[PDB]
Structure 1
Amino acid sequence: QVQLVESGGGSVQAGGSLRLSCAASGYTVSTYCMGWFRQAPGKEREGVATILGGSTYYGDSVKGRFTISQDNAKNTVYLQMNSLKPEDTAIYYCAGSTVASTGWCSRLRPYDYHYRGQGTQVTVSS
């Protein structure tokens, strides 16, 4: 079938960086809107970043610190996270839609996308 596998998470000190990766199987990453959403413990899910070709979109609290990018040769989508804060602690999920609309991708709602990974924990300690 279609498999999305996230890796790269772990436990890091505040101010540090991490690089999450989302490897897709049976699904080409560069043709459809993909993204990351997170879920912090005790809270509702939130959109983090989305990408469609060269167009990228970021949630307002991570813009400037995170970068989403893709590698077509590895069929992988990355989430570079810089200057991590304790509030960034959460499970991060990779997701892939069946849509190739930039307008739709710009709504930053990757929790509504068809395919979703099992998620990877990011724990930031102060």
Structure 2
Amino acid sequence: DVQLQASGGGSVQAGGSLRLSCVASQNLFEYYTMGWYRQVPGSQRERVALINNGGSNVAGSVEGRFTISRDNAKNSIYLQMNNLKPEDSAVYYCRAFGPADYWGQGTQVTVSS
């Protein structure tokens, strides 16, 4: 089955930066939409950004700080964060979307004041 494995999470200080990378076991990014979502502890997942061949979108709560970028040849998606705040701490999931929906297993991201 299709598998999405995220990486790059950890703990950082306020105002810092982090790089998340999610890799797929097959070549699937060309026919699917890739999305980054965050799950605050005790809250439903919300969208962080989506990307396709035609461009990208970034949510207003994270707009101006977070950016979503795709790399088809390496079969990976990369999210670049800067000026991280303690409110950004959550479990980040990389979602493959299209004919079928596949959910990443999540990565823990923590930001401390």
TM-score in terms of structure 1 length: 0.84
Name 1:17's counterpart in structure 2: 17
Post-superposition offset of 1:73: 1.4
RMSD: 1.3
Normalized per residue, which structure has more helix? 1
Post-superposition offset of 1:53: 1.3
21-30 vs 54-63, which deviates more?
21-30
Identity %: 65
Post-superposition offset of 1:25: 1.2
Name 1:52's counterpart in structure 2: 52
Post-superposition offset of 1:59: 1.1
Regions of 4+ moved over 4 Å: none
Give the letter aligned to residue 4 of structure 2.
L
Post-superposition offset of 1:42: 2.5
Q: 1:84-114, CA deviations, whole angstroms, 9 ceiling, x for partnerless residues? A: 0111000000001125xxxxxxxxxxxxx71
Name 2:41's counterpart in structure 1: 41
Work out which of the residue numbers 78, 94, 101 in structure 2 matches 1:114: 101
Unaligned runs of 5+ in 2: none
CA distance in structure 1 between the aligned counterparts of 2:24 and 2:12, rounded to whole angstroms = 26
CA distance in structure 1 between the aligned counterparts of 2:12 and 2:54, rounded to whole angstroms = 30
Name 2:61's counterpart in structure 1: 61
Name 2:110's counterpart in structure 1: 123
CA distance in structure 2 between the aligned counterparts of 1:125 and 1:44, rounded to whole angstroms = 22
Q: Secondary structure at the match of 2:87?
A: helix
Q: Does the 8 A contact of 1:30 with 1:70 survive in 2? A: no
TM-score in terms of structure 2 length: 0.93
Q: Does 1:26 align with 2:13?
A: no
Q: Secondary structure at the match of 1:60?
A: coil
Post-superposition offset of 1:48: 0.5
Unaligned runs of 5+ in 1: 100-112
Post-superposition offset of 1:23: 0.1
Count of aligned pairs: 113
Name 1:94's counterpart in structure 2: 94
